Symmetry: C6
Subunit: 150 residues, 6 copies
């Protein structure tokens, strides 16, 4: 609980900062259509907040960890999505097919990540159930073997 | 306060620096309306102050730690606010639906930070009240248990 | 697997963030033909992936370490490839030998890495075969000599 | 001197470097009147100096240490001053009140820095006087208590 | 040999990455002739590759330390050369005397540093050989003095 | 040599790299006359050199430490010099007096640092010689107490 809270939050901050500033530089460049700025700014919302957690942890009841986790998750999500939209906007007035194919090849791999991630979430719950089952069974055999020695 | 003085203060500096300089690159691109530059400049001022904190605590009255904490809070707050104004002014005279919807999501996320922050403030009151109350009661039970053998 | 996950995961974040954002600045610059932005987006997507892994080890189930390795590997590989494509686009309308020779000399460095990589794959085969052979043999002579006193 | 030699000096280098370089990028953007370049470049001079000390402490001394301290403080003051002048010059032919009102909000915080800084300057020296006083009194009373043992 | 593998890999990666990406920013700036972009990108191949080494150390074939060494040397060499070519090309259609004279003062320093580095190659071989000499000789005198009483 | 090998050498490299890349960005700006590009590239030479020294300690040649120290010093000097020359050109086609007064105030502070640095350099020599004096006195009394008491 401690070594991961310090170690992960130490280095996550760097990521958050670079995404803040580099998505920032991404914004100020005219040299979808409207929702782009929405997505990027909501990104800045997610990373700004998760780093605000990176400030809150002086005293450091386990939900706060998961809140930090899903925060960073959404951070990486919106960063990837809106930079894809940057590959979108860069190729608009000189081509309009490149960007479509961009999201068409990559977002498929997004759904790939969602797929494998939910696979191993269910693997954690499933092995929790299996470990609980076999452990409970061993506890029962211990109950009988203990009942012999009375 | 001290182990947190090393752990948190080690990491604050990077955030302050990158937000300062990348806020610089944010400023210089013309190739509300007037208060934007003001907001950015006070923002970068606050981050400068937080850096002065990152140097000031060398020889080692704990409120100064809180000064760094909520000072930094204003740091990321003003950063998000001013990037909201960047999507605002940068895409204002070239579109008016992108930036409007931007602030429509951003004012929502400011209310998100205030909301969740007061939420977990109140949660601190909740588990502090239950655990503290049971503590006072248990201390009374220790008083009775001591009075029994008199 | 443990200490290497903390040290390697500790340092990978820097690579992912810097190459991601610096490729970002690469994007918004016009001052193959269409698929370039796609390739860059898969690159920064991959470094994003290695970063999401850099957060993922909270619940921690051992393939993920090597998956992290493949993430960063693809990160530097594709970063090289896309900067090669940057020298492609930058030296196309002002020369056609510079960029051609660019990709033609860098793909050679690809064949360099595949060559040395499969070589040291075979070297791992060398220590695996020799260690396995000597271990099995000493176990065999020890097996007969042990059977003498049985 | 030593434990603080680790704590402050480990982190100072990164901040000094990033403020130096992004002040560099700060220079090149036209897309008071003359003293701007003086203030900004003099800032970069002071922070360059702070890096010179941040390298100099090899033999591992509070005279020169305090000299570094005032160097860095004055450095950050110059940072805020010249970045205010950057927000000034970048927006000159497009408003003269926006940046003016900026300084109207900033100079308040200038006197804020001097105000809080001197408040805890003389208050800290005052608590030094209290500690010295209590020390002299307790040691003298210990002398009288020794006269009891005559 | 090992402490440099851990500590040096900790710190070298940061610099190498920054120079890789900042070489990217080096690319998109015009606002020999053709082989330049190849040279910079192949440099990024060298630092990218050395970063792949910085990933390879999960189990931690001991020459790989030396591969890290000459990899890093070639990295910084190519960096200096290609930035010299940037100082060339940025000021080419706007001057032809500045950068030429630049190389006139600097490439001499190229042979200066390669020269001194190989100088201390000669010194390292000389004093390592000298230590071996003192060992063999002292072994001879001690060998005779012990050999009399055998 | 050891505590500094971990201490100063651990952190200085980061700054050196930042100055390399950000001086690179310094070059590419057309908005003295010729020696500018020379100075910036020579800066990149010195900082590259300091990085090569910070890499050399793989076999673990102690003069190289002092070469590294003066290397980093010269690095920061040259960085300041060429960014000063950019503050020159930024105020070249729109004014020529501001930057003049800037450099005239900065070179004075350069000679300030050189001046006091050699001042208390000589004081360091003074405490070395004086420490030798007190050592001589205690050693002389040790000589009398030694051979006199035989
Ligand atoms: Cl660090
Ligand atoms: Cl560290």
């Amino acid at each position: 609980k401690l070594q991961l809270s310090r170690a992960k939050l130490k280095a996550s901050s760097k990521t958050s900062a670079l995404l803040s500033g580099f998505a920032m530089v991404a914004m100020v460049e005219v040299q979808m259509l409207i929702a782009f700025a929405i997505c990027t700014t909501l990104l800045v919302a997610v990373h700004m907040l998760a780093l605000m957690i990176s400030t809150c942890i002086l005293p450091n009841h386990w939900y706060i960890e998961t809140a930090w986790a899903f925060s960073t998750l959404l951070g990486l999500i919106l960063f990837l999505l809106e930079i894809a939209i940057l590959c979108w906007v860069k190729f608009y007035d000189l081509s309009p097919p490149a960007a479509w194919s961009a999201t068409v090849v990559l977002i498929l791999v997004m759904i790939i990540f969602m797929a494998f991630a939910i696979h191993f979430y269910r693997s954690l719950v499933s092995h929790k159930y299996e470990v609980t089952v076999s452990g409970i069974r061993e506890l029962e055999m211990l109950k009988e073997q203990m009942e012999q020695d009375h």
